[PDB]
Protein backbone atom coordinates (compact mmCIF):
# COMPACT_ATOMS: atom_id res chain seq x y z
CA UNK A 1 0.00 0.00 0.00
CA UNK A 2 3.10 2.20 0.19
CA UNK A 3 3.63 2.14 -3.61
CA UNK A 4 7.26 0.98 -3.65
CA UNK A 5 6.79 -1.55 -6.50
CA UNK A 6 6.87 -4.45 -4.01
CA UNK A 7 3.51 -6.10 -4.70
CA UNK A 8 2.33 -9.67 -4.16
CA UNK A 9 -1.33 -9.52 -5.23
CA UNK A 10 -4.02 -7.13 -6.48
CA UNK A 11 -7.57 -7.56 -5.19
CA UNK A 12 -10.92 -6.19 -6.37
CA UNK A 13 -14.27 -6.46 -4.63
CA UNK A 14 -17.57 -4.76 -3.96
CA UNK A 15 -17.24 -1.51 -2.02
CA UNK A 16 -19.69 -0.87 0.80
CA UNK A 17 -20.77 2.61 1.89
CA UNK A 18 -18.44 2.35 4.89
CA UNK A 19 -15.46 1.98 2.54
CA UNK A 20 -16.70 4.78 0.26
CA UNK A 21 -16.90 7.21 3.16
CA UNK A 22 -13.59 5.85 4.47
CA UNK A 23 -11.75 6.78 1.26
CA UNK A 24 -13.24 10.27 1.11
CA UNK A 25 -11.57 13.26 2.75
CA UNK A 26 -14.87 15.10 3.05
CA UNK A 27 -18.43 15.38 1.79
CA UNK A 28 -18.99 17.47 -1.34
CA UNK A 29 -22.46 18.98 -1.08
CA UNK A 30 -22.54 22.03 -3.39
CA UNK A 31 -22.58 22.04 -7.23
CA UNK A 32 -20.05 24.88 -7.35
CA UNK A 33 -16.81 24.54 -9.30
CA UNK A 34 -14.93 27.85 -9.73
CA UNK A 35 -15.75 31.38 -8.63
CA UNK A 36 -16.64 33.28 -11.80
CA UNK A 37 -14.54 36.29 -10.74
CA UNK A 38 -11.89 35.23 -8.21
CA UNK A 39 -11.04 32.14 -10.32
CA UNK A 40 -10.74 30.05 -7.16
CA UNK A 41 -12.50 26.87 -6.04
CA UNK A 42 -15.25 27.02 -3.45
CA UNK A 43 -16.13 25.44 -0.11
CA UNK A 44 -17.68 21.96 -0.25
CA UNK A 45 -17.84 22.27 -4.04
CA UNK A 46 -16.64 19.82 -6.65
CA UNK A 47 -13.17 21.42 -6.47
CA UNK A 48 -13.01 22.31 -2.76
CA UNK A 49 -9.45 22.63 -1.47
CA UNK A 50 -10.42 21.53 2.04
CA UNK A 51 -11.68 18.19 0.73
CA UNK A 52 -9.11 17.62 -2.02
CA UNK A 53 -6.05 19.54 -0.80
CA UNK A 54 -4.60 22.89 -1.84
CA UNK A 55 -4.30 23.91 -5.47
CA UNK A 56 -1.07 25.84 -4.92
CA UNK A 57 1.81 24.28 -3.02
CA UNK A 58 1.85 25.08 0.71
CA UNK A 59 -0.91 27.69 0.87
CA UNK A 60 -4.31 27.64 2.56
CA UNK A 61 -7.38 29.45 1.20
CA UNK A 62 -6.63 32.93 2.56
CA UNK A 63 -2.87 32.38 2.52
CA UNK A 64 -2.31 32.27 6.27
CA UNK A 65 0.72 30.03 5.64
CA UNK A 66 2.79 30.50 2.48
CA UNK A 67 5.92 28.74 3.73
CA UNK A 68 7.55 25.34 3.45
CA UNK A 69 8.04 25.19 7.23
CA UNK A 70 4.31 24.41 7.64
CA UNK A 71 4.04 20.70 6.83
CA UNK A 72 1.09 18.52 7.79
CA UNK A 73 -0.72 21.22 9.77
CA UNK A 74 -4.39 21.77 8.95
CA UNK A 75 -5.23 25.45 9.28
CA UNK A 76 -7.95 26.40 11.74
CA UNK A 77 -9.72 28.80 9.35
CA UNK A 78 -10.60 26.87 6.18
CA UNK A 79 -9.29 23.44 7.15
CA UNK A 80 -7.00 23.23 4.13
CA UNK A 81 -4.20 20.88 5.13
CA UNK A 82 -1.09 22.76 4.03
CA UNK A 83 0.97 20.28 2.01
CA UNK A 84 2.17 19.37 -1.48
CA UNK A 85 -0.11 20.15 -4.40
CA UNK A 86 -0.50 16.82 -6.20
CA UNK A 87 -2.73 15.49 -3.43
CA UNK A 88 -5.48 16.81 -5.70
CA UNK A 89 -4.65 13.75 -7.80
CA UNK A 90 -4.81 11.44 -4.78
CA UNK A 91 -7.52 12.46 -2.31
CA UNK A 92 -11.17 11.69 -2.91
CA UNK A 93 -14.69 12.96 -2.24
CA UNK A 94 -18.07 11.43 -1.56
CA UNK A 95 -21.76 12.32 -1.73
CA UNK A 96 -24.35 11.11 0.77
CA UNK A 97 -27.47 10.23 -1.21
CA UNK A 98 -30.91 11.22 0.05
Amino acid sequence: MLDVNFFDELRIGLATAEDIRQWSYGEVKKPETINYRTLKPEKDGLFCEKIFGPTRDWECYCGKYKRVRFKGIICERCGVEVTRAKVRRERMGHIELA
Binding site: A15, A17, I20, R21, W23, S24, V28, P41, L46, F47, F52, K86, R88, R89, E90, R91, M92, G93, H94, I95, E96, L97
Partner: peptide, 9 residues
Amino acid sequence: DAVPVIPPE
Protein backbone atom coordinates in the same frame (compact mmCIF):
# COMPACT_ATOMS: atom_id res chain seq x y z
CA ASP B 1 -26.35 5.11 -0.98
CA ALA B 2 -22.97 6.92 -0.85
CA VAL B 3 -21.28 7.67 -4.18
CA PRO B 4 -17.54 8.47 -4.39
CA VAL B 5 -16.08 11.46 -6.22
CA ILE B 6 -12.93 11.19 -8.36
CA PRO B 7 -9.98 13.47 -7.53
CA PRO B 8 -10.31 16.88 -9.21
CA GLU B 9 -7.03 16.54 -11.09
